[PDB]
Design an enzyme around this catalytic site. Structure first.
Site, mmCIF file in Angstrom:
data_model
loop_
_atom_site.group_PDB
_atom_site.id
_atom_site.type_symbol
_atom_site.label_atom_id
_atom_site.label_comp_id
_atom_site.label_asym_id
_atom_site.label_seq_id
_atom_site.Cartn_x
_atom_site.Cartn_y
_atom_site.Cartn_z
ATOM 1 C CE1 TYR A 1 4.038 -16.151 4.380
ATOM 2 C CE2 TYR A 1 5.537 -17.435 2.963
ATOM 3 C CZ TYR A 1 4.297 -16.810 3.176
ATOM 4 O OH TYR A 1 3.355 -16.865 2.158
ATOM 5 C CD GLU B 1 1.344 -17.196 7.619
ATOM 6 O OE1 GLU B 1 1.541 -18.131 8.348
ATOM 7 O OE2 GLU B 1 0.608 -17.245 6.615
ATOM 8 C CG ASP C 1 -9.814 5.604 2.641
ATOM 9 O OD1 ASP C 1 -8.591 5.939 2.796
ATOM 10 O OD2 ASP C 1 -10.250 4.918 1.670
ATOM 11 C CB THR D 1 -2.517 4.551 0.460
ATOM 12 O OG1 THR D 1 -2.763 5.943 0.173
ATOM 13 C CG2 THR D 1 -3.641 3.712 -0.027
ATOM 14 C CE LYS E 1 -4.464 6.830 -2.364
ATOM 15 N NZ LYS E 1 -4.731 6.454 -3.772
ATOM 16 N NE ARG F 1 2.123 2.127 -6.373
ATOM 17 C CZ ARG F 1 1.172 2.968 -6.691
ATOM 18 N NH1 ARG F 1 -0.137 2.665 -6.605
ATOM 19 N NH2 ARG F 1 1.589 4.115 -7.192
#
Ligand SMILES: Cc1ncc(COP(=O)(O)O)c(CN[C@H](C(=O)O)[C@@H](C)O)c1O
Ligand SMILES: Cc1ncc(COP(=O)(O)O)c(CN[C@H](C(=O)O)[C@@H](C)O)c1O
Ligand code: NA
Ligand code: NA
Lengths: 410, 410
Positions: free
Chosen positions: A49, A51, A195, A221, A224, A230
């Site tokens: 974790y 955060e 984008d 992304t 691609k 991903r």
């Protein structure tokens, strides 16, 4: 040997690995990632974790995660020439949500590319959070040229007065002029977001000019054309905007980042920083032009906008088959995978469409070149022309297998 | 091989593996996943775009992906006794967003557990999309008992009139009465959503009552007690809600799902269906309780609510060290990682807090039992009591190494 515990799952994984080996993958948004990218996603970083951001986390024992996330960030900055980067978005969609949250408010007006013309769902579909929260008003391509008309878009923006203009597309084959998009934004006091999800690898290789110096914020992304895992990524040169973007990703939209995927981003970004990546870019361009050229010459097929200067193109298939859905199903029977796709000013149902979208990154990542690209397109033309003739397809399938064995996936 | 191409990255990855091995991880939201879970997410499923749902995708080449996703879905349904599941959410936060999107409208009133008493950011924090988009009103625990007081919650709900009540927590140690939560919801005509992220593995093991028969919609992370990959999951028994939730996940909030992570979800769900998971759960409960008892019996520490019936507990550390951040840093010096944490009615700054949060799942997954748990908590007590005796910290750190050497991570 954990696979014996779950053969149903692992057999299915094996079947997908073979499906991918035995297909010609022309879906323009896909690629074939390196073993190192897969390996990084497969690490015990998934246990952690984290955060927050590097050096300012909410949990103990994140000093090594921080090195990994900082590699990703520093590599994104260096590769794209941006002063700031955020590598936490879980997807292109979350990346875009964070930008909207950082730059505008619910109800503000936004211009983005019409979905029939190649804009993404998150660029204002009424079924996406994008259209539900903000007032999106779409710009289109010229109906004759199927090109972006920057004068028309400027006059529209002058009427609409958006707070934000979004440029970038999922299915536009030509060079987008980011300098003009910023002129247009400036003319009305709008922010410009680009984008570049589809073209990020070309931007990285030098085959598509970069939006980065022109957009207030660039999203993408990592999968691609960039050939990474991903996920999403957000870039800007403005420090104040960067702070907002950071708050927006977390705690605004997300919780803990996927730090194993972030490691994989770092892996991919270093791959794209290597000189070989330019040569990959170069072949992507050539392979797509070669496949496009076949359809261009054939008289029963038209290529949207007449060709392509990137990794993809669309084809109107309605002279030869009823619609794109059908074209997709047929090419699938000869192990050629793509997707149906609306064309500008689409007349048919969304679920049929008139077109197919074709891309070269995945076949190019398998080592295929111009000749193989050309042949693949011959095969597509040929299968579509003989769709009712099982003996032809069966033969095309046989030939496809020769090619896939010759350029093995891994 | 590929590690040689990128040593700074792989050096960091290998360092995290070693750090996980050499630390006692008590962060209550962490676990140690199986090699199988990690391997699933290190597969070439990452190369596949699969927008939509099984059998109703927007791309060809998805028949095997459909097998994988459907396995994940059916195993969730089975393990949790639910008629519908959605395995696409990228995270718990995204799962929660989707459910709000499905059930309520922006500006609606929602009740959520107070962030200090254990509610999550996505349960109404002003810095979260949750608090920004909806009108959240918090409920707390009783000041004296530190327990949910279902009569007070009902009275508050009758005044506030929420459209939705959210139940579930990040830092509540006692058994939640879900039947009571649904009774409250029904009394004010509200929906009930339960975010069982922390407890989902204990629901699965049989050691916490299921919210599934009582919540209209249950969300969870697949990581935490469930011991799965990072990601989210949504369940419901109502077919109309399920349609909405699916549309909310995609195209509402996300785009393409992470099918490699989904494979990993399928892996973990089958692991949790195995009878051995029930024993894991029992050990989780016994280990957390053995740790808590040390602090209960010590006169300078107080456990919030006086103990636990789950995997976690909070300890007020303020009689021994200044705040929770201090306690967190001290323990880190002896290779025990946890997080500082607000306690109910917290008086100190959120950056400092009065508390630490301790959990058992990770140590339990390494194979530690009660005696190791108790020893760990004794070292925590001893480290905090001697935080300014470098020589004691040093000795504890050495004892910790003996223990971690003896319970190898993988
Ligand atoms: C321009 C663009 N931006 C963002 C995204 C979203 O990224 P995700 O949330 O990570 O999936 C995509 C996905 N594009 C799909 C594609 O091109 O195949 C499209 C059809 O919806 C995209 O094309
Ligand atoms: C109850 C609850 N729901 C949802 C989430 C969201 O999950 P994510 O978006 O997948 O990270 C968490 C994460 N919990 C952290 C934790 O407890 O360590 C929390 C305090 O911020 C959680 O505790
Ligand atoms: Na033509
Ligand atoms: Na005590």
């Amino acid at each position: 040997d954990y696979k014996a515990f779950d053969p149903e799952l692992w057999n299915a994984i094996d079947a997908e690995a073979e499906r991918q080996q035995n297909n010609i993958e022309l879906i323009a948004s896909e690629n074939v990632v390196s073993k190192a990218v897969m390996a990084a996603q497969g690490t015990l970083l998934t246990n952690k974790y984290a955060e927050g951001y590097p050096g300012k986390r909410y949990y103990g024992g994140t000093a090594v995660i921080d090195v990994v996330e900082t590699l990703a960030i520093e590599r994104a900055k260096k590769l794209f020439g941006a002063k700031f980067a955020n590598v936490q978005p879980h997807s292109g969609s979350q990346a875009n949500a964070a930008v909207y949250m950082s730059l505008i408010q619910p109800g503000d007006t936004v211009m983005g590319m019409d979905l029939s013309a190649g804009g993404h769902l998150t660029h204002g579909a009424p079924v996406s959070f994008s259209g539900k929260t903000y007032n999106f008003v779409s710009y289109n391509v010229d109906k004759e040229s199927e090109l972006l008309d920057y004068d028309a878009i400027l006059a529209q923006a002058k009427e609409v007065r958006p707070k934000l203009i979004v440029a970038g597309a999922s299915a536009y084959s030509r060079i987008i002029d980011f300098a003009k998009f910023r002129e247009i934004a400036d003319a009305v006091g709008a922010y410009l977001m680009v984008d570049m999800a589809h073209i990020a690898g070309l931007v990285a290789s030098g085959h598509h000019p970069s939006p980065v110096p022109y957009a207030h914020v660039t999203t993408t992304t990592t999968h691609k054309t960039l050939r990474g895992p991903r996920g999403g990524l957000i870039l800007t040169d403005d420090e104040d905007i960067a702070k907002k973007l950071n708050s927006a990703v977390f705690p605004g939209l997300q919780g803990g980042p996927l730090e194993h995927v972030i490691a994989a981003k770092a892996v991919a970004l270093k791959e794209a920083l290597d000189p070989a990546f330019k040569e990959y870019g170069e072949n992507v361009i050539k392979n797509a032009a070669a496949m496009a050229d076949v359809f261009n010459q054939h008289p029963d097929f038209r290529v949207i906008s007449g060709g392509t200067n990137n990794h993809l193109f669309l084809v109107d298939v309605t002279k030869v088959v009823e619609n794109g859905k059908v074209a997709q199903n047929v090419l699938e029977e000869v192990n050629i995978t793509l997707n149906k796709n609306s064309i500008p000013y689409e007349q048919l149902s969304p679920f049929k469409t008139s077109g197919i979208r074709v891309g070269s990154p995945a076949i190019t990542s398998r080592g295929m070149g111009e000749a193989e690209s050309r042949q693949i397109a011959e095969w597509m033309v040929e299968a579509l022309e003989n769709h009712d003739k099982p003996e032809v397809l069966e033969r095309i399938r046989g030939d496809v297998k020769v090619l896939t064995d010759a350029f093995p996936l891994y």
